[PDB]
Sequence to fold (103 residues):
Amino acid sequence: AALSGLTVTGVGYSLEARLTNINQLEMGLLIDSDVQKQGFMIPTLPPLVIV
Amino acid sequence: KPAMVEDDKTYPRLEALTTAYRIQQMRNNAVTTLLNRADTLKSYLGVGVPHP
Fold:
């Protein structure tokens, strides 16, 4: 009763292949270095007095 | 050739290149030249006619 009427047909597929570029031809992840320069300055402060 | 792999199947040795060179120069072109010379003589002189 449960399987009464079911029909199953195969539709398509997808294929997984790599391109083995023995001569090499491909982009990729570049790696470089950068530098951030930052400075920190010191001020003066209001004085204490004795008279 | 892919120039990071050496081969002997995707590349037959230099002997194959030399063989192709020798056959091309010796047989086909020479036969073509001979037949074209024959046809040229046919066209220019006719048959059985000796020119001065």
Observations:
- Chain A has no helices and no strands.
- Chain A touches chain B at residues 22-23 (CB under 8 Å).
- The two ends of chain A are 109 Å apart (CA to CA).
